[PDB]
Amino acid sequence: VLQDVFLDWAKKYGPVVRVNVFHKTSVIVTSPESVKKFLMSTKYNKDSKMYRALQTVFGERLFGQGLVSECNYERWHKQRRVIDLAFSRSSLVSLMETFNEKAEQLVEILEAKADGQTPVSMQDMLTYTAMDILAKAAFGMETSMLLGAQKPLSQAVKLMLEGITASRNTKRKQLREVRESIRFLRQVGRDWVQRRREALKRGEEVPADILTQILKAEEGAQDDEGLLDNFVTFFIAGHETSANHLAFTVMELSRQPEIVARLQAEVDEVIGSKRYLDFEDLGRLQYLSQVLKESLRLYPPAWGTFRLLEEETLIDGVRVPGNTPLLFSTYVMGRMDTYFEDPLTFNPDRFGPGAPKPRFTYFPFSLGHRSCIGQQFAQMEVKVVMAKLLQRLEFRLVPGQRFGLQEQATLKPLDPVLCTLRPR
Ligand code: HEM
Ligand SMILES: C[C@@H](c1ncncc1F)[C@](O)(Cn1cncn1)c1ccc(F)cc1F
Known part of the structure; x- marks a missing residue:
């Protein structure tokens, strides 16, 4: 696991280490005092060199200049302020019905x-579940992969x-298969954009959501290319990492x-045997919230982020040249014994009441x-999904299944978490 190599280099060579990441040179910064400085300021923005390859994959356009891949502060800020409307409290409250239907079906x-x-x-x-939740909550479409x-x-x-995974971590049938798949995703986008536009044209009123704001952000634009970038952006970001996070948690809880x-006792205490979970009940699932927090410390699907260091500056006594990407990793910091006592132990108590919250060592x-605009969206959906599983089912992991990570497009379980199931 590439991230595990960076961990050893951080523990051995200190808080400022020059590295090769996705065949590009960058500097890994692992002091929490430096995590604050660079991540908590608008001064420092994303390095376009690191996100460039995801904008266009194997000669075919993919994420484009969407909310994630857009590194220029100004172009990002204009669309962020528009898309923000889709992630308001009452916007997410209206998505609780969607979170519930899909969990129940699963x-x-x-x-x-x-x-x-x-x-x-x-x-x-869990992938299908995460996919179904997103497609409806964001686009009003049912994929029903479940x-x-x-x-x-x-x-x-x-x-x-x-x-x-093949683009950033570096035969012909695969290349052919990938190019078609990226077209397919964007073609689905075009179709789903046309369905909403035809619904608007025929007079119908549609509930406000993510699709509403990504259409609003590109108002008066010459083509839908930017809108497809943002469609791809959310179709992927709104299911993938949430699916992996869920998969990591289920695997570890075995x-x-x-x-x-x-977890069951709490689930018995706050939600009982009730089928529909209300929004006010989510905040009462404090221990589940803690268990999911610890799961993300050891298994963050998104290991971190890149900032551009424009001018040569000194970090922790080490001088780093200009035009250099700074690598930040919550995976690395989560596993260092100087920030977390006995780092490899899954201990939900770390995030318990009265316990000092991690200070720039966990992100x-x-x-x-x-930061993640969909944080609350994810935290809501993963509480709802996990709470229902804890209500109804007991899981036993199939003998032979490992507990490892694969550094793919995101961090995800090595084995597909095969389980024999039994009612509680
Ligand atoms: C366990 C769940 C998830 C985790 C761990 C996760 C991880 C992250 C992280 C670390 C970033 C920063 C990316 C970077 O700096 O390169 C991010 C941003 C992003 N996330 Fe999430 N995320 C998840 C849930 C969601 C979901 C459900 C949505 C969609 C509804 C979402 C959409 C976004 C978008 C569009 C961005 C860019 C935000 C911006 O820069 O303005 N993610 N995610
Ligand atoms: C985890 C990561 C990811 N996912 C899938 N392929 C590549 C990736 F890098 C993600 O950050 C998405 N994501 C954010 N919050 C939840 N998911 C992302 C980052 C940059 C980007 F250009 C596109 C993009 F999708």
Whole structure:
């Protein structure tokens, strides 16, 4: 795991280490005093050199200049202020119905296979769930991958992400398969953009969401190319890392029996046997919130971020040249024994009440102005999904499944989290 190499270099060579990342030179910064300085200021912005390859993948345009890949502060800020409207409190409150429908459906499908003998890929099951949640909450479209639909669309998503893995971490049938998949995603975008425009044209009123603001941001634009970039941006970002985070948690909780019981007890305490989980109930799931926090310390699907150091400056006694990308890693900091006592132990108590919150040593959703706009969206959906699983099902991991990480397009479980299921 490439990130695990950076960890050893940070522990051995100090808080300022020059590295090769995605065949580019960068400097890894691991002091929490330096994490604050660069991530908490508008002065420092993203380095276009590191995000450049994701904008266009294998000669085919992918993320473009969307909310993530746009490194120029001005172009990013204009669209951020518009897209922000889709992530308001009441905007996310209106998405609670969506979070609930999909979690409930996921559980029943798993409940029908719960015999304690039938292997079920939890990585796939959670991916479909995360995909269904996003497609509706963001675009008002149902993909129903959980019900076995949209098989070609999911394949394309997989291949695209493998194409990402081959692009930044460096045979012909794959190249052919990837190029088609990126077109497919953008073609779906065009179709879903046309469905909303036809709905608006025919007089219909549509509920405010993510799609509404990414259309609003590109108002008076010559073409829909920027809108597709933002469509791709959210289709991927709004399901992928949430799917991996869920998969990591389920995998780890298979070997944490004591933790599962208090999770169940809480689930029994606040949500009981109730089918629909309300918004006010989410904030009462404090221990679940803690367990998910620890899961993100050891297994952040997005390991960190890149800032551009424009002028040669001294960081922690080490002088770094200008035009250099600064690498920041919450994965690395999460596993260093100088920030976290006994780093490799899954201990949810780390984030308990009265316990000092990590000070610039833990940033799964990043920090500052370029932090995750979908943080609350994700935290809401993963509480809802996990709470329902804890209500209804007990999981036993299939013998032979490992507990490792694969550094792919994001960080995700090595094995697809195969489990035999049984009712609680
Ligand atoms: C466990 C869940 C997730 C994690 C850990 C995660 C991780 C992150 C991190 C670390 C960043 C910074 C990226 C960078 O600086 O290169 C980010 C930004 C982003 N996230 Fe998330 N995220 C998740 C959930 C979401 C979801 C559900 C959405 C979509 C609804 C979302 C959409 C975005 C977008 C569009 C950006 C760019 C924001 C901006 O720079 O203005 N993510 N994510
Ligand atoms: C994790 C990461 C990612 N996902 C899929 N392929 C490549 C990636 F880098 C992501 O940050 C998305 N993401 C953010 N919050 C949740 N998910 C991202 C970053 C830059 C980008 F140009 C596109 C992009 F999708």
